[PDB]
Design a protein around this ligand. Structure first.
Ligand code: XG4
Ligand code: K
Ligand code: MG
Ligand code: MG
Length: 327
DNA sequence: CGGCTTACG
DNA sequence: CGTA
DNA sequence: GCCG
């Protein structure tokens, strides 16, 4: 099928090298502002992840969605020579390496990285010498960059969840913490830990996240956070280690229980899976999907879901467990 | 050709 | 602009 | 860059 939400995509697969190469080109397209080419290369990479066996000859790409002349030539050169000249040229270019380094900083997007690049900046130390150019968020990202470049491990995640649950249970007894993001899809490591928080009584979650953050702050666990009312927090946590501690990015989201299936579906991802599912919803079904609900514009009504299963059924899609949403 | 991702901080 |  |  043409959309990633119509097929299972496991975490590990049989075309790792080919998909990695196409994702380099996708990433390079994004650094140059070409969102359309980024999407096509990401989609072609995702198709290969969904295949049941390795691609060994060009003919296997026949009829595969999102493979045209450019992506097929990339695959062809990898099959024939083990390397793609275009991909290798991107890898070693100063532009790619610096945009990759800069955009990996928490608080730095493509627009900011591109301005710094054009101004001649190239390294983290270059940015550190110009702290007048940095927001407080970027200063935090730069200071903690080395720890944040270390993958979070599944072992780390359970220790963090207990701490978050402790603060959440004091902020509002009966509130729950659900692991979402990449670790919910089965990843053994990640760039951060994502949590979704709710309470079984509609309305009780109002105003919860400031109370949660206050309690985490008082426990001494918050190295950075954005802080009147808010429902999403992007922070840097102090995580325990043997004889020391390390900084870890943690995302917290609060949703009312009525919206929990939609929020769980959205924040579980993958990011490409979510965009493809929303695109499918809008273009094939005429329904508008987000992390709050599923809207029929013609009837001006919202579909009530009690589960992610509900949502897949309402879109006419076979259910995909989180481990099969690794588009 | 137009379309390509979303709401919140 | 950033979360990304 | 590719789809419809
Ligand atoms: N609508 C929407 N959702 C998004 C977007 N980006 C991410 N999400 C949703 C879907 C994502 O699954 C979720 C969390 O995003 P991360 O924590 O940045 N990534 P993950 O946990 O997959 O991996 P790792 O942390 O190891 O890099 O947020 C976006 O641009 N749009
Ligand atoms: K960034
Ligand atoms: Mg994550
Ligand atoms: Mg996250």
């Amino acid at each position: 099928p043409a959309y990633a939400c119509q097929r299972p995509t496991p975490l590990t697969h049989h075309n790792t090298g080919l998909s990695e190469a196409l994702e380099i080109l996708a990433e390079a397209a994004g650094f140059e502002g070409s969102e359309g080419r980024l999407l096509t290369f990401c989609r072609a990479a995702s198709v290969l992840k969904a295949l049941p066996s390795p691609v060994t000859t060009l003919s296997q790409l026949q009829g595969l969605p999102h493979f045209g002349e450019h992506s097929s030539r990339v695959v062809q050169e990898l099959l024939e020579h083990g390397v793609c000249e275009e991909v290798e040229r991107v890898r070693r270019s100063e532009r790619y390496q610096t945009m990759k380094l800069f955009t990996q900083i928490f608080g730095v997007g493509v627009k900011t990285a591109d301005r710094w690049y054009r101004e001649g900046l190239r390294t983290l130390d270059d940015l550190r010498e110009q702290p007048q150019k940095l927001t407080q968020q970027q200063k935090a990202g730069l200071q903690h960059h080395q720890d944040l470049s270390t993958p979070v491990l599944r072992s780390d995640v359970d220790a963090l969840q207990q701490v978050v649950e402790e603060a959440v249970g004091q902020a509002l007894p009966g509130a729950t913490v659900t692991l979402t993001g990449g670790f919910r899809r089965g990843k053994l490591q990640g760039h951060d830990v994502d949590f979704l928080i709710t309470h079984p009584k509609e309305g009780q979650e109002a105003g919860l996240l400031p109370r949660v953050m206050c309690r985490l702050q008082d426990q001494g666990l918050i190295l950075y956070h954005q802080h009147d009312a808010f429902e999403r927090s992007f922070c840097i946590f102090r995580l325990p280690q043997p004889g020391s501690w390390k900084a870890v990015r943690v995302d917290l989201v609060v949703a009312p229980v009525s919206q929990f299936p939609f929020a769980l579906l959205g924040w579980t991802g993958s990011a490409l899976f979510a965009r493809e599912l929303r695109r499918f919803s809008r273009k094939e079904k005429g329904l508008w999907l987000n992390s709050h609900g599923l809207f029929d514009p013609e009837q001006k009504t919202f579909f009530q879901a009690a589960s992610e299963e509900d949502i897949f059924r309402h879109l006419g899609l076979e259910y995909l467990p989180p481990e099969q949403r690794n588009a």
